[PDB]
Amino acid sequence: MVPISPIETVPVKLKPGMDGPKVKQWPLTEEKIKALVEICTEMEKEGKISKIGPENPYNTPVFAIKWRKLVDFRELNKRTQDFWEGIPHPAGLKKNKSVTVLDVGDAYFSVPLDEDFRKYTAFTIPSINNETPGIRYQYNVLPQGWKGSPAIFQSSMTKILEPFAAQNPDIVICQYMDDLYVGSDLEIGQHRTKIEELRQHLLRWGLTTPPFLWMGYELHPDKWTVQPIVLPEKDSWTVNDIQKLVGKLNWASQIYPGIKVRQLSKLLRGTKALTEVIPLTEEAELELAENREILKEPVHGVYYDPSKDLIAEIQKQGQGQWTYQIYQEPFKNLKTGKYARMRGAHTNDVKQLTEAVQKITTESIVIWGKTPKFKLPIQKETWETWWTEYWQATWIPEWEFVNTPPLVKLWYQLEKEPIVGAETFYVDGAANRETKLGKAGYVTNKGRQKVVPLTNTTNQKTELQAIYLALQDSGLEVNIVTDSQYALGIIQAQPDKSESELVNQIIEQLIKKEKVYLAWVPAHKGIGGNEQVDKLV
Amino acid sequence: IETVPVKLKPGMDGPKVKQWPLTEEKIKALVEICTEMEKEGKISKIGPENPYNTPVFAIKKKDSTKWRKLVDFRELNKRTQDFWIPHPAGLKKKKSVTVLDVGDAYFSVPLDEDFRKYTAFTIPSINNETPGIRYQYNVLPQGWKGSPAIFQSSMTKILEPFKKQNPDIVIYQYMDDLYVGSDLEIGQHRTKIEELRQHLLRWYELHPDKWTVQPIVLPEKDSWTVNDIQKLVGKLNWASQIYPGIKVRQLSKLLRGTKALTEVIPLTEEAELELAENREILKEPVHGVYYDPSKDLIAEIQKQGQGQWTYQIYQEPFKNLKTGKYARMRGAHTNDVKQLTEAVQKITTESIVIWGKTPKFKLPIQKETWETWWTEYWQATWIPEWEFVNTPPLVKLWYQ
Ligand SMILES: Cc1cc(/C=C/C#N)cc(C)c1Nc1nc(Nc2ccc(C#N)cc2)nc(OCCCN2CCOCC2)n1
Ligand SMILES: [Mg+2]
């Protein structure tokens, strides 16, 4: 007998203050019992389990389902300590000339459970007609379904495989789920040779045993893709069905370019239900139709070659949607993706471009461990002006301008100094809260004035209204004095788009303007030109 | 040579904190470092039975191309009991202060056996392929709050000859850092610090005197536009939240009517007197401003453009413990985030020198941007706490 290296057990403890599981053994049919006896018999013959006595107060219920024994550890997992813990992405793997598969189903039960914990795994098989004490049993190995079995199994296996990994950089190895997958670029002879070497290495521990379907992916030696996407086709649409649909679309968006999930996700707002028949806007129908039309033909991503540049390129899809491709060489994509704006009040394209860049950066660090070179639809000058003048710190990693409309631009720029020869509009607004009744307006140095009465409004909305008014009635250059910190706060953030239609109209006005100086003063200080008396009434 | 019993605080478990992604070079460097740390018994590989985790990454300090292992202990630190040196309030008064890294020393002392589980950390793998390399500490870890507190006895025992030799030199210790102040001449000071380095061996320079607290100033102009006066009044109205007797009414009275912003307005006598009295008031210090050690320090930072940054340290609003400004060019000009990060570091260092603890920053930046880039520029062994402000403050233009 060649001596086997023992797999060292991992010490396992129960959560503090907790006692091991005690749960009533379920009554069964004579048939099921007859099956369980044979199963547990051959298992005991294989050393997987062992018969125990009454000295063990702990009991775990056991079922039989059609043959197959099922131990329900549900109450043991709640009383068992936390263990330590994210799948790899195909765009991160490398091309493999040959990939060989080996069965590890023999080695799963070769991982021993910590002895002092074994007593907690106890389960009982009821005898015929309940006329005897049920056969008592405990696990000597990691039980299928237990809390810590996956972590401990993969830990032991990793620990085993590590020495024949590090010594063979020309070999790649992975375990899914019951299998061992090896791969290499070596000539077929050298590959088979190394396979044999590994088989022997595992033999030491006493383990004698394309395209691949792996985690919703299809893996080919030369490339990868997603397993086919089935989008349910029904004239009736449920909420859970919207969730499933959106999920599958997101899943498909990592390789298929141009996928848009917004219109379908807009309908999931503030609703927890598994059943409603929810209509769809023509926008949503066209969206799903376009996704069906994109999915009409298959596409493939390639694997990663460290010897080449890593490039990310981004395009504006419109309506808060952005789409990106990541490739080493033109038209051959490592992978693709999308980015949707956060739920804001007011926002602009430059901030969204920034956010997308950061997202892609982090994703790239996860997958390839490095930051890609960016190709962005924004001119160097625009980014310059923006980041120099922005009140917030901002940064983008190395990048270049790619000219692919629509371009990201700055739609307006406020002046740094008051404008000479330009009319000065002192604006204000006020609203009585209980009646919701208010006034908005302005006075100017030239004597120009307005006050507009407003129903169903507030101080903030009137303060915005006043500014809008001053923008409507002024020439291409204008100075505007406001006392509103709210308004100034909104405009100093530089939105090019807003939820509020008022702010939107303001933006349109700013866009039409050649020069706008926006100045602030404190309210109610009697500062000349600022007239509370007009709007307050 | 013997471990002091250490525990957590009542009703708290060990930290389980997600490890963020690292680049290929940072991972390689951390592997090269932890390998040797493992051969030296400083750390040890652990198993799946350890649920906890603490983040880790790698930095580079000044004048060194060699990487350093940085563990982010903030969570574990706040889960430790502490309460085991009253701050040296003369350290900020010295002509010069030098910062030395004594972290290495901590590895000469063992950590309590039961506590080691809570120092667990993970070298991540690229693309989630292999599980990470997991370690736990054996000796005293750098960045942990318990390390200086526990090693403190040995530190006092080491520095006795130097301290008693010249009792003009102030010595302070914060985390892995040792701050040594002196009033001597910079050459003789540097040679004295060299002497201290050799003295420590057998077992960055500051000038806190070059700083004071910044006053609020008002313009001196020979002619005022309406705009100039509107700004002046805004600023004074802001200052009135700080100082008692500020009065804007004559200055406002200059503006009555509705006028063009660029129009020059001559100051009346009442207005000039009022402005004078306001200057006088702004000269005096702020009233009833005191440091309460039981309260958090708060740092606010504003980007002034063109490489300039203003900041304030306080505890209660409109009571400022310190105010400052930074133009420094370290090669960060094309990068806002590097400037912000250097700024946060500097401000933190000043905060440590003065009050002995770090403040909690409020940064002019988005969470996602900062979080993506700040480790690239970080040269310090400690990590402060920070929030993010997404709505532009008006105080910016009043601190410039
Ligand atoms: C073998 C294997 C099988 C499956 C699923 C099977 C089922 N069911 C899943 C994985 C994840 C792996 N493991 C693997 N596969 C590849 N390539 C590859 C090529 C072709 C085909 C086909 N046909 C399949 C796979 N490359 C690597 O690793 C290289 C990364 C090197 N670096 C190190 C530095 O940081 C960055 C990564 N690992
Ligand atoms: Mg108002």
Numbering used by the authors:
A (entry chain A): -1 to 64, 71 to 89, 93 to 216, 225 to 552
B (entry chain B): 5 to 88, 94 to 212, 232 to 428
Please share excerpts from the published article on this structure.
Reverse transcriptase (RT) from the human immunodeficiency virus continues to be an attractive drug target for antiretroviral therapy. The drugs that target HIV-1 RT are divided into two classes: nucleoside reverse transcriptase inhibitors (NRTIs) and non-nucleoside reverse transcriptase inhibitors (NNRTIs). NNRTIs significantly inhibit the catalytic function of RT by binding in the non-nucleoside inhibitor binding pocket (NNIBP). The compounds co-crystallized bind the NNIBP causing RT to adopt an “open” conformation commonly observed for RT NNRTI complexes.
The attachment of a longer propoxy morpholine to DATA compound 2 retained potency for RT (WT), RT (Y181C), and RT (K103N/Y181C) variants. Antiviral data also complements the analysis from the structures as compound 2 retains nanomolar potency for the virus containing wild-type RT and variants with Y181C and K103N/Y181C mutations (WT: 0.0012 µM; Y181C: 0.012 µM Y181C/K103N: 0.0013 µM). Compound 2 retains affinity for RT (WT), RT (Y181C), and RT (K103N/Y181C) variants.
